[PDB]
Amino acid sequence: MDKKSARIRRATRARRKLQELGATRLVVHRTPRHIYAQVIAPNGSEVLVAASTVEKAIAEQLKYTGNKDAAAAVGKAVAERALEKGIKDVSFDRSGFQYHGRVQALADAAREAGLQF
Amino acid sequence: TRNGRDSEAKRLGVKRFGGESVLAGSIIVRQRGTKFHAGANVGCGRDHTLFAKADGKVKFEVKGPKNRKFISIEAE
Amino acid sequence: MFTINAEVRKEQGKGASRRLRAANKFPAIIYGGKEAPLAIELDHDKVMNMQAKAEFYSEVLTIVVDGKEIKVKAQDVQRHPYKPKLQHIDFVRA
Amino acid sequence: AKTIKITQTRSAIGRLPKHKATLLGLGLRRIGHTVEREDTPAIRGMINAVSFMVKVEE
Amino acid sequence: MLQPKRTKFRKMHKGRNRGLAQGTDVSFGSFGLKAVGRGRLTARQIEAARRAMTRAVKRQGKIWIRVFPDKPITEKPLAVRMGKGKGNVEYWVALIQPGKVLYEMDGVPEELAREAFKLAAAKLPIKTTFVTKTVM
RNA sequence: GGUUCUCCCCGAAAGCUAUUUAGGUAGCGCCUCGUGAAUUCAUCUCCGGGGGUAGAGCACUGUUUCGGCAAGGGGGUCACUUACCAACCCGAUGCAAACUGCGAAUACCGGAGAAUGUUAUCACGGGAGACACACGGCGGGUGCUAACGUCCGUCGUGAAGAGGGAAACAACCCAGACCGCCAGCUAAGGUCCCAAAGUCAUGGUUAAGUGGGAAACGAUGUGGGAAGGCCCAGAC
RNA sequence: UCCUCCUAAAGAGUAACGGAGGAGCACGAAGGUUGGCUAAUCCUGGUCGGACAUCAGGAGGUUAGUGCAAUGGCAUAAGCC
RNA sequence: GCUCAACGGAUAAAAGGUACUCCGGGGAUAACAGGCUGAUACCGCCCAAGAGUUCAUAUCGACGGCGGUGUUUGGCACCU
RNA sequence: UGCCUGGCGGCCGUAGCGCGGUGGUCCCACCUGACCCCAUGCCGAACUCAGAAGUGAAACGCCGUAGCGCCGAUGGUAGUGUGGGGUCUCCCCAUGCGAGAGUAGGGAACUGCCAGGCAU
Ligand SMILES: [Mg+2]
Ligand SMILES: [Mg+2]
Ligand SMILES: [Mg+2]
Ligand SMILES: [Mg+2]
Ligand SMILES: [Mg+2]
Ligand SMILES: [Mg+2]
Ligand SMILES: [Mg+2]
Ligand SMILES: [Mg+2]
Ligand SMILES: [Mg+2]
Ligand SMILES: [Mg+2]
Ligand SMILES: [Mg+2]
Ligand SMILES: [Mg+2]
Ligand SMILES: [Mg+2]
Ligand SMILES: [Mg+2]
Ligand SMILES: [Mg+2]
Ligand SMILES: [Mg+2]
Ligand SMILES: [Mg+2]
Ligand SMILES: [Mg+2]
Ligand SMILES: [Mg+2]
Ligand SMILES: [Mg+2]
Ligand SMILES: [Mg+2]
Ligand SMILES: [Mg+2]
Ligand SMILES: [Mg+2]
Ligand SMILES: [Mg+2]
Ligand SMILES: [Mg+2]
Ligand SMILES: [Mg+2]
Ligand SMILES: [Mg+2]
Ligand SMILES: [Mg+2]
Ligand SMILES: [Mg+2]
Ligand SMILES: [Mg+2]
Ligand SMILES: [Mg+2]
Ligand SMILES: [Mg+2]
Ligand SMILES: [Mg+2]
Ligand SMILES: [Mg+2]
Ligand SMILES: [Mg+2]
Ligand SMILES: [Mg+2]
Ligand SMILES: [Mg+2]
């Protein structure tokens, strides 16, 4: 299995469970250069809020978009953006990535900024 | 060698069909494996018995990339 | 050049088709191209004799239906399980 | 609805349970018995199940 | 004499023999011998008939056997009562439905094939008829 | 084994389960009587369902034949080769209760609705009887697609059902007898005489008393139909 | 006595001294959870090494595996750490 | 704490003989004969490779096929 | 609004496979480095971290293409409920339902949310 098909397999179980639970998930996507965060509604097809390093307002304050400091910036931003829209309780979907390093920097910052999970 | 044996029948099968209104907890199908899978508001017991987790109507569907059979329960 | 005389069928299904064959006729069908399929009925002895010449299965035939001429080719054929008889024919519009 | 007349034309003896039950639903009690019923698909459906032993007049 | 080399199971329900045949065209040879009646062909019958047609052509040309006796038939011997287990397999039959091409042949003149198939048919317990290849 | 007066209403079972049980018995099913309760139940129509059966098919599991291709094995070398056998694979052809990349009719569960049906439904309670079934139809196992055989499923009838028909003939066809009639119409089945009703009408077939028992197979019996070969360049 | 399949007639059930098999145990991990992983078979290459051990690539795609019979399941694995 | 496995487990505890026999029952169930069946048997036929120096059918006939009888060996358990 | 890309879903092969072409500013990918976070029953392959010298080779995406997969009628055929019938191991007739396979043919998916790059 190639890296990607392998990760999607790694992600399927947790997503079905969250789907079953009807949870609003904070979905993360990581790349060597960029990291992305999306709060998606239980229907699985609507993005309520989002943040990432490909948007200039965020990458502008960052040294390198593909590291842990950046991950902390993205996480903090989704949280804020999300809280301002009344969104508070979500579930973390690490999307087949280890709960670690960058993903965990993003998660920790998102919690820091009041997002509940 | 000699034949002459069999076991008691286990009465597996569908207990509530499409459209039937059931109370939560009601067994919808007894099966040996997951011929049918648990969908929304339906649970899977240790012998793969599918049961209602909510009051409502039984609903059979076919879903996903493997064309699998799912039983769910619709509020009525 | 084969010339087959046909009438359009007034019925369809198993009952009607067996009644045709008890009456020394047999059903057939014409399909292909833009027009709708045309269900027809044929004289058995006349087409039996015709199709005993290889030319039938490789030449452009003409079916005449209500004094209209349809140019076709034989496409498939169902024969009786064990008698020298025809049960049905597909023609494709040529 | 519109009214039709239904007459039983053969015996019920020896018939399938479901047919007896269908005669009962029509209210036919015996050979020759004529009954006035409404012309609904539900009624036509019972006539149809036992059509071999009833005659309809419209 | 034809027989399955091995089978999943030794014995078989009697079953029934309804329907028309599959494999009703001459698909390998030039001529065929076709069943017109319904019934069972035993392996010995199939063999007796194969011999006859093969004498008849002096082992010239080529012969195909479209049927295969894959149904085991059991019997209970004399002086045994009913029950006490299903009988023992004694022989093998093919189930025949109207329309089955039984044997095919080619590499010989039609006249000789008809003769050979005539000799063979006299060995069989079901009426048959002579058939030919057909374009389509 | 036998069990004694009369009339009326309803009306089974010969199945499951358990049984030192198997021709006994018990619970349940099925009968009856009473009390109570729902639009309770049945048929049909429309609506919502799951099927893996008939049939089919051959990707799967097995089996099967023909052709191509082919590792491998058997034989000869003193590594190479033989008219041998050859799985897999490709193309073609079948078979399957314990095969399914397909798949009905029906049947069954559920919703809603009318008509009909003496509540036909469910609950509780008083009384049981019954747990040897038979034949016939359909779908099967067993047997020999033997048995007036045997074992299940499902319907019918007998059982516990008279009357008409099948010569006679529980179980097949028609049909369900409250009583009386020296009226009438029909069902299956029939209409020359025994014997109630056509020696009916019309078009054909048969010449065998076929009809009114029996297969492979044999044959210038005879009727209908569509084609073909040879032929006044003289065919048979 | 018990389990699996067929007979069993596409809901349940359904008989015969009908057709085939199995159980009367195992496991403190072979249970729980988190995290991860993915068979069989064949072709080619490779010390000893052979038809078959372990190594590499390719085809393949669950035909493997499941403590054990059969059937139904199983990749989100129920399989393997 | 029972392989009470005859597994809803009669007792904690149990094998045989009867041609010396006996009672209650059954044609619910065997032996004779009848009946149903006809695999088996018996009799006949269909095909014809082959035997018969030559030649299938004078006399026979392999591999297979279809029947008749009720008639042997059996099946069934309908009558007693 | 238009093209392009990423993410998350609907749908579950008319949507897949193959073959040919094609893309790197952006995105994606490979990639660079690895003491360290973290990892290998060995291995920085994978997981992971710090990055940006190189390349779209592979992968991925897009466009094309009927070798295959897939979908697929009409008509006939098989079966079958009910009623009737025959020469009743099997069939036929009336009526209703009506496959499977095959044939013609279709087919190189469709679609929503958010974000990024580009252009008018
Ligand atoms: Mg019909
Ligand atoms: Mg009464
Ligand atoms: Mg006891
Ligand atoms: Mg419906
Ligand atoms: Mg079948
Ligand atoms: Mg071959
Ligand atoms: Mg009661
Ligand atoms: Mg008893
Ligand atoms: Mg009994
Ligand atoms: Mg019985
Ligand atoms: Mg009997
Ligand atoms: Mg009695
Ligand atoms: Mg009389
Ligand atoms: Mg009365
Ligand atoms: Mg008279
Ligand atoms: Mg006579
Ligand atoms: Mg069932
Ligand atoms: Mg059923
Ligand atoms: Mg385990
Ligand atoms: Mg996990
Ligand atoms: Mg090797
Ligand atoms: Mg017991
Ligand atoms: Mg003595
Ligand atoms: Mg003495
Ligand atoms: Mg005595
Ligand atoms: Mg007796
Ligand atoms: Mg006797
Ligand atoms: Mg008996
Ligand atoms: Mg007597
Ligand atoms: Mg790397
Ligand atoms: Mg490239
Ligand atoms: Mg096209
Ligand atoms: Mg249709
Ligand atoms: Mg369909
Ligand atoms: Mg179709
Ligand atoms: Mg198809
Ligand atoms: Mg945009």
Coordinates of C-alpha atoms (C1' of nucleotides) and ligand atoms in Angstrom, one line a residue, chain I residues 73 99-102, ligand 35:
Chain I
rA73 C1' -33.2 -3.2 -24.1
rA99 C1' -36.6 -14.6 -15.8
rG100 C1' -31.3 -16.2 -16.8
rA101 C1' -28.1 -16.1 -20.9
rG102 C1' -27.6 -13.8 -25.6
Ligands
MG35 MG -32.7 -9.9 -19.2

